[PDB]
Amino acid sequence: AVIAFGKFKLNLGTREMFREDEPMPLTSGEFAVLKALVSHPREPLSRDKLMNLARGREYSAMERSIDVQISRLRRMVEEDPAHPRYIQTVWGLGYVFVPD
Numbered sequence: 573a574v575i576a577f578g579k580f581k582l583n584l585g586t587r588e589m590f591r592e593d594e595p596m597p598l599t600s601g602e603f604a605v606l607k608a609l610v611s612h613p614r615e616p617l618s619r620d621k622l623m624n625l626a627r628g629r630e631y632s633a634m635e636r637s638i639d640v641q642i643s644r645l646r647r648m649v650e651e652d653p654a655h656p657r658y659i660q661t662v663w664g665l666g667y668v669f670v671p672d
Contacts, residue, residue, distance in 0.1 A: 575610045577658050577671055580649055582610065601635025602645055604628055609659060609669035616662035642667055 575582040581590045584607055589596050598606060608617060608625035617625065619638040626633035635641070646653035660670050 577610075578649065582606070584611065596648065599635065600628075600630055600632035601626075601641050602648070604632035604635075605638065605641040606645055609667065613669050613671045616665040616668040618666040622666065 573583065573585070575584065579592045581593070583589070587598060587603055589598050604626035605622060608622050612625075622638050623633055636644075642659060643653070646656050646659050649658055650656045658670060660668050662668050
């Protein structure tokens with residue numbers, strides 16, 4: 573129901589997210605990208621696959637370029653974006669959500 577990783581708790585249904593229980597906002601583009609990643613734990617997703625999975629009934633997949641959304645999301649959930657733990661890169665493939 574609520575995805576939990578690190579100090580985060582994410583509710584895919586309501587789009588509510590918390591950092592150590594303090595409410596944090598997810599723009600449509602961040603949410604669309606985070607949801608795709610989080611709902612496919614350990615499945616590396618190409619940028620194309622991400623873009624396709626991010627599409628919703630609202631303006632989201634077209635908000636920003638995948639890499640930038642990824643960069644933005646890493647700034648929000650990683651202790652060190654340069655060495656991400658949750659939103660990782662799979663060389664020659666794309667990106668992957670690693671749970672825990």
